[PDB]
């Protein structure tokens, strides 16, 4: 229940400081990526510790983003669909790609995928806005059968 953003910038840029007015659940507690800590420390004495924490989170975010981009662009995803004699009858949902990511040893959470559901067969490439500056692009092949 803090008053400071936590490592994810909201709508059109607000700086990293004590500015998030608390409606209670509007977008602050709506996003599960926010801080849960006492308030007496989080006025000025814990500000430097929070800056160090934000730097650590930024660097690990960059490292993990690069790792995921590398392992995604080296290992493209594969599924299969039932075809209407050349027309795509099967359906593909983001649940399937989330499951594949989770099985491949790199869990992707439920709070970064905001794209529409995919409908179609053949090779697809989608640039997923998981990150603002270091986003990734995924390639998927669905076998027609």
């Amino acid at each position: 229940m803090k008053v400071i953003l936590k490592q994810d910038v909201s709508n059109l840029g607000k700086r990293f400081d004590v500015v998030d007015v608390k409606d209670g659940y509007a977008i602050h507690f709506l996003f599960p990526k926010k801080l849960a800590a006492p308030l007496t420390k989080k006025s000025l004495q814990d500000r430097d510790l929070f800056l160090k924490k934000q730097q650590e989170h930024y660097e690990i975010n960059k490292a993990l983003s690069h790792k995921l981009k590398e392992v995604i662009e080296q290992t493209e995803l594969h599924f299969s669909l039932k075809e209407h004699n050349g027309r795509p009858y099967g359906s593909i949902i983001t649940k399937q790609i989330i499951n594949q990511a989770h099985t491949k040893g790199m869990a992707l959470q439920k709070f970064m995928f905001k794209d529409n559901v995919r409908l179609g067969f053949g090779d697809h490439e989608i640039t997923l806005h998981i990150f603002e500056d270091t986003t990734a692009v995924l390639k998927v092949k669905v076998t027609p059968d």
Binding site: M1, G24, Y25, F29, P32, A36, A37
Partner: protein
């Protein structure tokens, strides 16, 4: 009954008066809403939360 799934607070049953001050048996039901919680060792499904407890869990970070 119509009580929240976090604490125990019985609904209020008492007497209400009219413009002529007529004693009538009236009821007040506690303000409960369905809310989702997340914590260790399961117990993450939707429960019933009172607003009085909702504010406390909001500031105390019960998720």
């Amino acid at each position: 009954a119509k009580k929240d799934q976090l604490t125990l607070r019985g609904p209020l049953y008492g007497n209400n008066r009219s413009h002529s001050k007529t004693i009538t048996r009236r009821k007040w039901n506690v303000n409960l809403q369905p809310c989702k919680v997340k914590t260790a060792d399961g117990k993450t499904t939707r429960i019933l939360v009172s607003t009085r407890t909702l504010r406390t869990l909001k500031k105390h970070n019960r998720l």
